[PDB]
Design a protein around this ligand. Structure first.
Ligand SMILES: Cc1cc(-c2nc(C(=O)Nc3cc4oc(N5CCOCC5)nc4nc3N3CC[C@@H](O)C3)co2)ccn1
Ligand SMILES: Cc1cc(-c2nc(C(=O)Nc3cc4oc(N5CCOCC5)nc4nc3N3CC[C@@H](O)C3)co2)ccn1
Ligand SMILES: Cc1cc(-c2nc(C(=O)Nc3cc4oc(N5CCOCC5)nc4nc3N3CC[C@@H](O)C3)co2)ccn1
Ligand SMILES: Cc1cc(-c2nc(C(=O)Nc3cc4oc(N5CCOCC5)nc4nc3N3CC[C@@H](O)C3)co2)ccn1
Lengths: 289, 283, 284, 286
């Protein structure tokens, strides 16, 4: 697949000179992303998302081409679509289809006054995110930064996996540059292994965010790491019922426990005992049914 | 794909379709709408010219809702084709219709100008999605804009909807909201724009599109009264608001006026309506 | 003050009403409404919100005299006046929920009055009229714009500029047409005219409709009495739809009182005491 | 003044006082001060029914009726009636369709976050309620977000006067209230309206942050403590602002915080009286 080539000055124009104030107070910045800031833009009659990158100039320019290459290969309804890029100006820009409901993280926390996601939407988002990861793994790609901040939500709350700057081919390797987000990372990934099984672990953490509405890490909390509640639940002090996000009216026990069962399996500490993504899809399908 | 229900599950969940205000929430497009509880989810169940036509607007609705999923459209959860009657099941809208909130029915407080602007933008995003996907609603009106827990606008009732100018023998819709061409049997998305213009006047004035005990009886007519400078839009602003500034109201009115152009071809398309409604909250 | 009648200077009142700013309070002004032969502004004296009536009337003195005599929990309190300056001012305790008319129409975004509050307001307004009649005063302009509502939605009758001690006749027929008894429209002055006007207020309370609407059928709210007695419609059909808590039995009981109040023969109307009793029995 | 109900009418209309939550098909809406609160339908009116040794409970029954008879204001929940005749003692109130401020601050059961604009209105309204109580020489003794109810228009209504007292400083043996909201002196048995001011200050911090007054799984566990963290300049109020708002400007938030800070003065006598709190909250809007 080949993409539209934009000039920097069109993107500068349509993002109001890359206005770094939030959209809520009249600016253009929607979020800070993987190695770059994400601005809102209007090209033609289309709202778009423009990522301006901002490790070193060698590495950033390398994760520019990686992203384009992976997005050229990987097109699926549960992955964010790349519209284009810009190499010519000062900074390197990537241009995406606009996701009007932002990230799952932000909707889980009801940021900027948005209403809480129903259990029904949450189930759809979980199934969708898993279809996206399944497509990546079937096509021998490892994401390496699965987390709620990288699951975007469109006009219909369809889940879209985003940020393939870190992504790799399959077609277990090791690396010196350990990258990702600590609170979502599998033990092996924290030690430099690169395997699709790390993606499964991180998805398990996402499923706990979906059930509880709690962020993966909160410095002002006990436990500070959301994965730890798996331990608290297995040692029967608490139950999953006790952690269910209280900002839902429509969550039945049976379906929540079924999603938890999937998350628990995804969070197995031995990489080899985790289910593969296909098993995760199937289990998430059976949950609805 | 949607959950396929048996009639007896829906009968169970609506307390045998209890027609007291009970389980009945309202009368809808060619059917009655009941409240239901499946698991811990509140839902809306619509139980449904001739025997040929109703069964035809059943499949139309499912087909359109299969294609059309958007945050500003009511979501179809499922249906039931067995049993005596045909049932459609939807996500429950705890704030009911815009018409009812505009009239403060059952003691609900008046919508602020701020919510009104959000509802207008939301309804237009819904219509835009329908038109982009080559669907014409044909019955845009405040009774078919539903409001969720956060007052997000949801377009509903796609029984009359059509794929994409044609003509017809069966002229359908709501008279007080209809464009002249639609009243003569044309079928175009431009008729939806006109009807949206009427909705925007309901939002600004809080008046229903038609009141038998009124002058003018048709809300559209105030456009004429305003253009011939006897009155101004300021004079029609819903008095049940404290937070409506002139500039933003006049900007919404400007959009409604353009939507209500009598020549279909001079009306703006829905995309232009979105843009104009966005600029109103800035600018 | 707190136990006294304050004599105010014009310049204090001018100061505290922002030079009598005639823009509405909603858009940052001081005007709250137009009243009986004057405009009513919001004011701040000390830490007290107040209502200042500048006339827009000659019979300034009537109002002061009647308010000096007539003090009751269901009548607005006069705090003071000002006879110096250009204009004549009357100063009242501020009524934070405004007029019944404005709350019936949900003006400025206020929520609809429940049936429960409506019943309390009806009973309260009648206690006020009863106090006036017991003390041999006739109001002459009973209407929903002259029933004010305090912090607790207690009804307070206001505007005694037209009041008399509360049968007499007159040349200057005064009042509000849509609320007026036939005899009052012909110049009679009797407390029985107050009862008739109260009956109209009770219909506003039940229906939420104003006494007169030029864009309506019937244009005069009184007329629904006829439409109901000739069995085309029923009172159930006119109940304000902006209520969730109105039961038929209590609404019909209030209507029964309004119907009796609206008898066209002044002598067949109940006196205010009977109206109180009937409104008490209604609660339930 | 109040409608007298028979127990069996109230039993009927609350589905035999079904103590399961409304979410799982029951009638219980919450636990109150020495009683449970159920949902009920009498005539066409939704209502709230509070079902409460024999001497003390029957004494807080008459206290509540007596205080509610005296204290009527738009920012206080209205008593509709009572029932003395059955097994248990019942109090019946106007139904508050938006529940408690606590529950709306936490977006319980999927309700959307309160805007800063509504939050300011709720704060002003709650203070008008407390001001009415203090002007009439009543002390609430359990001011907290669970006892500020919200009607169809999000008007604040102070509720639960079972613990309330006349003025209109006394002491007591039975120390009552909610620990996380209580002034130091109230925790030691003093009874003064100044304790109400302190508790209101905590409510204002809940409004600004959206955090509950106490969370066992948190640091600090007591919301009051953020006052210390802010005064010792590690953090600022900006850092604690509820992120579930789009419309909160710094200037107005800092002004509400200034009021809360003053309300939370540890020396009871340096706290502002409720009238000063109203004025400051008025100036904040603007
Ligand atoms: C890092 C990255 C991002 C993307 C990519 N991003 C978008 C995109 O459209 N994003 C986006 C849109 C938003 O719209 C709102 N709105 C405010 C709340 O109410 C509703 C409206 N917030 C939003 N926040 C967003 N953030 C920005 C980065 C991330 O935190 C998600 C599309 O691709 C692609 C590849 N790599
Ligand atoms: C015709 C049609 C309707 C729908 C569809 N309808 C709903 C739905 O939830 N409906 C609904 C919900 C309501 O909730 C309340 N409130 C409760 C709180 O207090 C104030 C009253 N009123 C309500 N009225 C409703 N009406 C029922 C008739 C229709 O005009 C909308 C959802 O899909 C779909 C497709 N075709
Ligand atoms: C004619 C006359 C008037 C008075 C007298 N008037 C007030 C007084 O306080 N009045 C008043 C208060 C108000 O408070 C609000 N609100 C604030 C909350 O939000 C919604 C707006 N609106 C209001 N309007 C008012 N008007 C004034 C004309 C009358 O139709 C009602 C007190 O005595 C006395 C003797 N003769
Ligand atoms: C202790 C006490 C209470 C009352 C008194 N209580 C109500 C009342 O109406 N209460 C109430 C209503 C509610 O409505 C919802 N809903 C869920 C969210 O969506 C909207 C609907 N939750 C609700 N919770 C309530 N509780 C009551 C205890 C407290 O936890 C809050 C009225 O007087 C009076 C005197 N002493």
């Amino acid at each position: 697949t080949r993409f539209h080539s934009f000039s920097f000055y069109e993107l500068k124009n349509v993002t109001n000179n890359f206005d770094e104030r939030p959209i809520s107070v009249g600016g253009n910045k929607m979020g800070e992303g993987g190695f770059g800031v994400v601005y809102k833009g209007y090209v033609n009659n289309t709202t778009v998302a423009v990522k301006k990158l901002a490790i070193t100039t060698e590495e950033l320019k390398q994760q520019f081409d990686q992203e384009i290459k992976v997005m050229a290969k990987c097109q699926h309804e549960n992955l964010v679509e790349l519209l284009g890029f810009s190499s010519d100006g000062d900074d390197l820009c990537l241009v995406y289809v606009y996701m009007p409901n932002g990230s799952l993280l932000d909707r889980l926390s009801c940021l900027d006054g948005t209403p809480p996601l129903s259990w029904h939407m949450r189930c759809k988002i979980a199934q969708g995110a898993a279809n996206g990861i399944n497509f990546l793994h079937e096509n021998h790609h490892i994401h390496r930064d699965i987390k709620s901040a990288n699951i975007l939500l469109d006009e219909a709350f369809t889940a879209k996996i985003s940020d393939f700057g870190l992504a790799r081919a399959s077609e277990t390797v090791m690396t010196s540059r350990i990258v990702g987000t600590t609170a979502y990372m599998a033990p092996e990934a924290l030690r430099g292994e690169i395997t699709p099984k790390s993606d499964i672990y991180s998805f398990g953490v996402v499923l706990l965010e979906i059930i509880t509405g709690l962020p993966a890490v909160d410095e002002h909390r006990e436990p500070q790491l959301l994965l730890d509640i798996k331990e608290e639940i297995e040692d029967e002090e608490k139950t999953i019922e006790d952690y269910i996000d209280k900002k839902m009216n429509d969550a039945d026990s049976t379906s929540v426990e079924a999603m938890y069962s999937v998350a628990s399996q995804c969070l197995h500490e031995k990489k080899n005992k985790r289910p593969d993504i296909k098993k995760v899809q199937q289990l998430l399908q059976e949950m609805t049914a």
